[PDB]
RNA sequence: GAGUCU
């Protein structure tokens, strides 16, 4: 059975007959009365085998007495019925028929190889026109179609001088006559003279095919089928329904059409009937064969009885319900069940409640095995009845098997690996599965009726894999982010919160206790509240420089309840950890601290004890939810009446015609959105510090113990957002569009919504629940694309010996630092020797892990940026080295050799997309954008440091910025960046570049709902290509008459002014242009679409004045749904509609000639004297002002970067950082934590292929894209031994294309495009040697990674040795 | 004087399922939807209470 | 085709 690889080729007519064991010459199935295989029918016993095991039809030869005996009477071999799914058959077609997959599957294959259009071939097939096969005198050209009339011409004049024929016969003779060797040479030699792009593309693809056609051992003949193979009967079964009715496959129905028409064709050829009749029959034969192979492809698919079309062969291969995706990359499984899950808060974290009767049916074979060992049952049938009667002895043995025998629990959807976890089963009384509360976060499992799948790991390997890898206690940190997924929620947080928090005096304040146990004594004795401030003696162990723990005793001022919680705390943590009032965010840090200090065991026990005490003290608290607990501010009706009057003011100004519709829309939303903030801040201020209590002193105040407040403050469930809808104001609801409804709901759920408020609320309700049903599948399809590309990638090597890495500056974005350097750089090999500021002693070695210890030292010395070894920079050919990846984020230690990183990376990216599409959608009612970024206020004192900024001073005396991507830094005393902002175009700076500012100063100011166009020169305004009606429109008022001009774009524009660009030209007093200082550009600002202009023609202006105001309408609340397409586009490496232009070679610029507005750049570098020319559109205002030392990859046009242009000009590390930053920004907006290394994994797979420029010393030569890994393995032998060095360029690929580019065709046909993959592999004669995981999952082998890693490499040495 | 018509009943925008939810006015639309949907799934008991 | 968990 065992084997090396699988190969695909075209089936020769000869080859088809080898598989066949007889010809099916009749369309009969079975006799209606004596139900048996018919004489040479589709279910023939003489051809495919006997229906019973070792029994002929007539019944002369029965059982193994007659082993290999073929009955002489009926003609049936006495063999297993197994032979009926294995033996195939054939049909000798009287006339050739084209194979649809080598005809319709574009590229046409038969047509691409003949260089003859598909249309032209089909005309020949359906007998519309003759094609010349070999015109004797070259009067008649080869592959020239002749109409029925034009055939009659040549027939009388020439006759035998030409051989033009019609039907599949003609295309087959046409494929027979063509010589691959002679035509291939000619195509090579005649490409020399022309050399264009699409000729050289198509002529080179024709050469590649012709050469691969020769080397594959395929003939072009075989594109047309003379013989048609038959599927074995058991694979297309005619079996009886329980009742007398029968059922059959749709293949039997398609085979019958083919055999009928083939047998009738033979009869009409026997009858020497006119050709008109014969042609109809040959068309019908082509139709039935084409329907059999791929039904719905050539024409409308042939329907059966049901009105639906008959399922063809191709259909059982292709796509989702095809063998690959449903019965091969995934399976139904023995020793499995499921049920409704329910809590087990008593359980330990390594345990789960498994019902009696479930576990009994699950572990049946192990019970029969124990029952024979103890001597209770003689045979299995006896043991079966003992278990079926559920005898008392059986429960005791079941109990024995299950101890120390783990079980796997799974939930849908399986988004990430933690969707399956192993537990020790606990037999329980009921029928419901009991799940441990702490693993509930990994499963996303609530108990409101979830169901979970049960699997038994049978084999010992599987028992050990379950316990060592997939056990719940081993899987604590998330592999996506190095943080614990096992974190208390709900009751547990509320309980520890209630315990730790203090209260004024209370019972027994300022007492003095011997220890944590006397604190539990006073609380249970009923003499102190858990909230009494008390001095207590507590002894904390803190860990020394060596492994030993140092003990320290001290009086601590904490509450009684805090002393009691210390009892749970293991020795090793300071007491400072339980001294604060604990919420969910703090409790997660406790187990993360404990994991890094103590280990795995302590955490698992600590996590449990936290769960136990958290639930129990939550229960003591008796925390509740009443209508009075939803406090409304007394001043709500005040805020609304003020805010109502403000909105009435803009609508009254709109009726006058002062403010426009779009302006009022953005302006009204800002008033209501700040009013919701005002009511909510009033609510939380009159809710949080509302408890005003009398102490034994006089009177003070503390945080309120309002039940709902505690629940949102602790973070147990709900948040301030939800409390708005409950007590404050419901807010702006979202349109189903995404755009925000102009009337928000003033009321809250305590007060109740009225008829209309509800009706408005339902718009947003339905649209959220709609995304939970629909948009989840765009997100889940990303998971799938990501997995198929990264699949094969595994840790192969320990250390690659590469020196390279990506430089990681800290993500300081938008005032507050969003992601420290520490977080981004943690658990990563230091690429280069990265020391302290004073370069006079190395601080960190080159090949060394970054432990939290070393990361803390980075903050001490203030390491700013650190070059870090990345997955992308690995020089491993085979997979990735352990060093380049670094620490397994799930394990907190160096990654093992053999672990599958590709899949882990895909899953981490895919999961939060997919699950967040269901989250704030069921939970979402409202909209909550606040995009009103009017002004940057700097918070620390600093010097203002602008970068990528070119401003110009205005009449007012204000530094106005005339650059799009201006950044604003905040430089401290020593000279390092603390805060960072985006200052936009046309913004007014308070202080210019280098000037000192104080803290809390408006350093920049601008208008958000408008993108002004600001001038760089002073003078008068000229109207150019601003013809009224063609390009712009006009509207006026009364008495005086103020008119505004509105620029139309290509949508609202006529065909008259399409090639007219509208622009506001600057001129002086005389009327001439005004040159922009220090440049030959006459001043001309191009106004885009929807641009409103209030200054009309002939108006005096200074520099810094706003010419036109482009509207900025974007009132969509950006959820996962609006940002995920961006992620998909990035991973798929799409150029945008307007790529920004970048300099290709470093050197001195000179601007050149022009094409009616369109610019040229004949740039001549200093070293490279040969020029590089490139065309530029008219409307692109350029950043560079020519004649300047420009380097590789300098922004010439402002605008979005193609990732292709980044990799092409600024290398791998540049494009990696573009993808990681752009993708990660989208998940950071949603608060999703994905390590950079996971994106880096997929980017590595995107940077798989590479195009070979210079000729090699193999058969790369030129134009052939090959994988990176392959060309380097050649270059290793070339650098040492010599011969022609192969120059290269690394190319970028999208996910969907990189997955299909893999040499494993079984990986490709299992992803998508099954019909195309199989045909291109069949014609090249490709051999898949089963490299990756997909391939071995398919064949049902051991994964060549993980535990099997060891095994697969051991087979690979058997192959090397001899 | 500009008023031409008026809603007949307080209940008219809602369905039969939703009319049976008490205090529907104080429920989010999203949960109200499931409640009326599950009210339909409610098996009748031995004693009609 | 009517549902259940996401
Ligand atoms: Mg939940
Ligand atoms: Mg649920
Ligand atoms: Zn027989
Ligand atoms: Zn490496």
Curated annotation (Swiss-Prot), chain A:
Binding site for Mg(2+): 446, 448, 450
Residues that, per the record, bind Zn(2+) 1: 56, 58, 71, 74
Top-tier EC class: transferase
GO molecular function, one term: DNA binding
Entry comment on modification after translation: Acetylated on several lysine residues in the presence of glucose.
GO BP terms, alphabetized: bacterial-type flagellum assembly; bacterial-type flagellum-dependent cell motility; cell motility; cellular response to cell envelope stress; DNA-templated transcription initiation; intracellular iron ion homeostasis; nitrate assimilation; regulation of DNA-templated transcription elongation
Catalytic activity: RNA(n) + a ribonucleoside 5'-triphosphate = RNA(n+1) + diphosphate
Application notes: Co-administration of salinamide and rifampicin or salinamide and myxopyronin suppresses the emergence of resistance to both antibiotics.
Cofactor note: Binds 1 Mg(2+) ion per subunit.
Result when mutating residue 490 to P: Resistant to antibiotics salinamide A and B
Keywords assigned by UniProt, alphabetized: Acetylation, Antibiotic resistance, DNA-directed RNA polymerase, Magnesium, Metal-binding, Nucleotidyltransferase, Transcription, Transferase, Zinc
Protein residues bound to Zn(2+) 2: 800, 874, 881, 884
EC number per UniProt: 2.7.7.6
Alphabetical list of Pfam families matching this protein: RNA_pol_Rpb1_1, RNA_pol_Rpb1_2, RNA_pol_Rpb1_3, RNA_pol_Rpb1_4, RNA_pol_Rpb1_5
Necessary cofactors: Mg(2+); Zn(2+)
InterPro entries: DNA-dir_RpoC_beta_prime, DNA-dir_RpoC_beta_prime_bact, RNA_pol_asu, RNA_pol_N, RNA_pol_Rpb1_1, RNA_pol_Rpb1_3, RNA_pol_Rpb1_3_sf, RNA_pol_Rpb1_4
Subunit structure: The RNAP catalytic core consists of 2 alpha, 1 beta, 1 beta' and 1 omega subunit. When a sigma factor is associated with the core the holoenzyme is formed, which can initiate transcription. The rRNA transcription and antitermination complex (rrnTAC) consists of RNAP, NusA, NusB, NusE (rpsJ), NusG, SubB, ribosomal protein S4, DNA and precursor rRNA; S4 is more flexible than other subunits.
Family, per entry: Belongs to the RNA polymerase beta' chain family.
UniProt protein name: DNA-directed RNA polymerase subunit beta'
Record organism: Escherichia coli (strain K12)
UniProtKB/Swiss-Prot annotation, chain B:
Record family assignment: Belongs to the RNA polymerase beta chain family.
Top-level taxon: Bacteria
Native source organism of the sequence: Escherichia coli O157:H7
Summary of subunit composition and partner proteins: The RNAP catalytic core consists of 2 alpha, 1 beta, 1 beta' and 1 omega subunit. When a sigma factor is associated with the core the holoenzyme is formed, which can initiate transcription.
Shown segment, full-protein numbering: 648 to 696 of 1342
Function: DNA-dependent RNA polymerase catalyzes the transcription of DNA into RNA using the four ribonucleoside triphosphates as substrates.
Protein name: DNA-directed RNA polymerase subunit beta
């Amino acid at each position: 059975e065992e084997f090396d690889a699988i190969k695909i080729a075209l089936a020769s007519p000869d080859m088809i007959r080898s598989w066949s064991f007889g010809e099916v010459k009749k369309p009969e199935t079975i006799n209606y009365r004596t139900f048996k295989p018919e004489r040479d029918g589709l279910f023939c016993a003489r051809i495919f085998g006997p229906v019973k095991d070792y029994e002929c039809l007539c019944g002369k030869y029965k059982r193994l007495k007659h082993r290999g005996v073929i009955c002489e009477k009926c003609g049936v071999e006495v063999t297993q019925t197994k032979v009926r799914r294995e033996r195939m058959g054939h049909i000798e077609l009287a006339s050739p028929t084209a194979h649809i997959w080598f005809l319709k599957s574009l590229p046409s294959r038969i047509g691409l190889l003949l260089d003859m259009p598909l249309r032209d071939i089909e005309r020949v097939l359906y007998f519309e026109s003759y094609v010349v096969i070999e015109g004797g005198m070259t009067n008649l050209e080869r592959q020239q179609i002749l109409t029925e009339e034009q055939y009659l011409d040549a027939l009388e004049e020439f006759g035998d001088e030409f051989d033009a024929k019609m039907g599949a016969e003609a295309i087959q003779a046409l494929l027979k006559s063509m010589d691959l060797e002679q035509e291939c040479e000619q195509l090579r030699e005649e490409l020399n003279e022309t050399n264009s792009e699409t000729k050289r593309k198509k002529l080179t693809k024709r050469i590649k095919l012709l050469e691969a056609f020769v080397q594959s051992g395929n003939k072009p003949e075989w594109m047309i089928l003379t013989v048609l193979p038959v599927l074995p009967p058991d694979l297309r079964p005619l079996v009886p329904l329980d009742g007398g009715r029968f059922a059959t496959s749709d293949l039997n129905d398609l085979y019958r059409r083919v055999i009928n028409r083939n047998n009738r064709l033979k009869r009409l050829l026997d009858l020497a009937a006119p050709d008109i009749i014969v042609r109809n029959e040959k068309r019908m034969l082509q139709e039935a064969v084409d329907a059999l192979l791929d039904n719905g492809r050539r024409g409308r698919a042939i329907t059966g009885s049901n009105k639906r079309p008959l399922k063809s062969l191709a259909d059982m291969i292709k796509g989702k319900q095809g063998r690959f995706r449903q019965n091969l990359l995934g399976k139904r499984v023995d020793y499995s069940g499921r049920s409704v899950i329910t809590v087990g808060p008593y359980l330990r974290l390594h345990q789960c409640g498994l019902p009696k009767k479930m576990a009994l049916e699950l572990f049946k074979p192990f019970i029969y095995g124990k029952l024979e060992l103890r001597g209770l049952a003689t045979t299995i049938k006896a043991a079966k009845k003992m278990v079926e009667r559920e005898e008392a002895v059986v429960w005791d043995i079941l109990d024995e098997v299950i101890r120390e025998h783990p079980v796997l629990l799974n939930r849908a959807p399986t988004l990430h690996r933690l969707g399956i976890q192993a537990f020790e089963p606990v037999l329980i009384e009921g029928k419901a599965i009991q799940l441990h509360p702490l693993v509930c976060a990994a499963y996303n499992a609530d108990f409101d009726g979830d169901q979970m799948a049960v699997h038994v790991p049978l084999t010992l390997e599987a028992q050990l894999e379950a316990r060592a890898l997939m056990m719940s206690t081993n899987n604590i940190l998330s592999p996506a982010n190095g943080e614990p997924i096992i974190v208390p929620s709900q009751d547990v947080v509320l309980g520890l919160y209630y315990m730790t928090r203090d209260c004024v005096n209370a019972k027994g304040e300022g007492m003095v206790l011997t220890g944590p146990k006397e604190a539990e004594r006073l609380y249970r004795s009923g003499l102190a509240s858990l909230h009494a401030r008390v001095k207590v003696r507590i002894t904390e162990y803190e860990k020394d420089a060596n492994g030993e723990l140092v003990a320290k005793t001290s009086l601590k001022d904490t509450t009684v309840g805090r002393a009691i919680l210390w009892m749970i705390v293991p020795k090793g943590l300071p007491y400072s950890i339980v001294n604060q009032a604990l919420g969910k965010k703090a409790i997660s840090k406790m187990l993360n601290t404990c994991y890094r200090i103590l280990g795995l065991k302590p955490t698992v026990i600590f996590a449990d004890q936290i769960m136990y005490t958290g639930f129990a003290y939550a229960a003591r608290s008796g925390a509740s939810v009443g209508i009075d607990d939803m406090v409304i501010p007394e001043k709500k009706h005040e805020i609304i009446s003020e805010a109502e009057a403000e909105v009435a003011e803009i609508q009254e100004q709109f009726q006058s015609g002062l403010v426009t519709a779009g302006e009022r829309y953005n302006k009204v939303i800002d008033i209501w959105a700040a009013a919701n903030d005002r009511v909510s801040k009033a609510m939380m201020d009159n809710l949080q510090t509302e408890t005003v209590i009398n102490r034994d002193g006089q009177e003070e105040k503390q945080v309120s113990f309002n039940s709902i407040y505690m629940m949102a403050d602790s973070g147990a469930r709900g948040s301030a957002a939800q409390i708005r809808q409950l007590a404050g104001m419901r807010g702006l609801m979202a349109k189903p569009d995404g755009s925000i409804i102009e009337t928000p709901i003033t009321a809250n759920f305590r007060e109740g919504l009225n008829v209309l408020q509800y009706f408005i609320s339902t718009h947003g309700a339905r649209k959220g629940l709609a995304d939970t049903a629909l948009k989840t599948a765009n997100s889940g399809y990303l998971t799938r694309r990501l997995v198929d590309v990264a699949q094969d990638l595994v840790v192969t090597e320990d250390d690659c010996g590469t020196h390279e890495g990506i430089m990681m500056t800290p993500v300081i974005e938008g005032g507050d630092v969003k992601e420290p350097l520490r977080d981004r750089v943690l658990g990563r090999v230091t690429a280069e020797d990265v020391l302290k500021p004073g370069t006079a002693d190395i601080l960190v070695p080159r090949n060394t892990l970054l432990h939290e210890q070393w990361c803390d030292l980075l903050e001490e010395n203030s390491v700013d940026a650190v070059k870090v070894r990345s997955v992308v920079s690995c020089d491993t050919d085979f997979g990735v080295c352990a060093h380049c990846y670094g620490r397994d984020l799930a394990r907190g230690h160096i990654i093992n050799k053999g672990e599958a990183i590709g899949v882990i990376a895909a899953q981490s990216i895919g999961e939060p997309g997919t699950q967040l599409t269901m989250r704030t959608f069921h939970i979402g009612g409202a909209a909550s954008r606040a995009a009103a970024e009017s002004s940057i206020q700097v918070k620390n004192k600093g010097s203002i440091k602008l970068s990528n900024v070119k401003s110009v001073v205005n009449s007012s005396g204000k530094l106005v910025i005339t650059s799009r991507n201006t950044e604003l830094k905040l430089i401290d005393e020593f000279g390092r960046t603390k805060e960072s902002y985006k200052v936009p175009y046309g913004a007014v700076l308070a202080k210019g570049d280098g000037e000192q500012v104080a803290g809390g100063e408006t350093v920049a100011n601008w208008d958000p709902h408008t993108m002004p166009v600001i001038t760089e020169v002073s003078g008068f305004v000229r109207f150019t290509d601003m013809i009224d009606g063609q390009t712009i429109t006009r509207q006026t008022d009364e008495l005086t008459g103020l008119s505004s001009l509105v620029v139309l774009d290509s949508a609202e524009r006529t065909a008259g002014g399409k090639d007219l660009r509208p622009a506001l030209k600057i001129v002086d007093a005389q009327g001439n242009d005004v040159l922009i200082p220090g440049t030959d550009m006459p001043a001309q600002y191009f106004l885009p679409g929807k641009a409103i202009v209030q200054l009309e023609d002939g108006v005096q202006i200074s520099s810094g004045d706003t010419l036109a105001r482009i509207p900025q309408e974007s009132g969509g609340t950006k959820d996962i749904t609006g940002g995920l397409p961006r992620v998909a586009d990035l991973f798929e490496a799409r150029r945008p509609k307007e790529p920004a232009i970048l300099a290709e070679i470093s050197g001195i610029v000179s601007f050149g000639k022009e094409t009616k507005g369109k610019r040229r750049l004949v740039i001549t570098p200093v070293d490279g004297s040969d020029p590089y020319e490139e065309m530029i559109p008219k409307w692109r205002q350029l950043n560079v002002f020519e004649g300047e030392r420009v380097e590789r990859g300098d922004v010439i046009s402002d605008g979005p970067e193609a990732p292709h242009d980044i990799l092409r000009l600024r290398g791998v590390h540049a494009v990696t950082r573009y993808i990681v930053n752009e993708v990660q920004d989208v998940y950071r907006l949603q608060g999703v934590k994905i390590n950079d290394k996971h994106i880096e994994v997929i980017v590595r797979q995107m940077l798989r292929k590479a195009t070979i420029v210079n000729a090699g010393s193999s058969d790369f030569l030129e134009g052939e894209q090959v994988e990176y890994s392959r060309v380097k393995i050649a270059n290793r032998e070339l650098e040492a031994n010599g011969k022609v060095g192969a120059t290269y360029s690394r190319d970028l690929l999208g996910i969907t294309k990189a997955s299909l580019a893999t040499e494993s065709f079984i990986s490709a046909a299992s992803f998508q495009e099954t019909t195309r993959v199989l045909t291109e592999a069949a014609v090249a004669g490709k051999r898949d040697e089963l490299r990756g995981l997909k391939e071995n999952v398919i064949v049902g082998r051991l994964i060549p990674a993980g535990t099997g890693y060891a095994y697969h490499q051991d087979r690979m040495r058997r192959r090397a040795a001899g | 004087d500009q008023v031409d018509y008026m809603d007949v009943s307080t209940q008219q925008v809602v369905s039969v399922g939703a009319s049976l939810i008490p205090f529907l006015e104080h429920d989010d639309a999203n949960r109200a939807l499931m409640g009326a949907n599950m009210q339909r799934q409610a098996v009748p008991t031995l004693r009609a209470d």
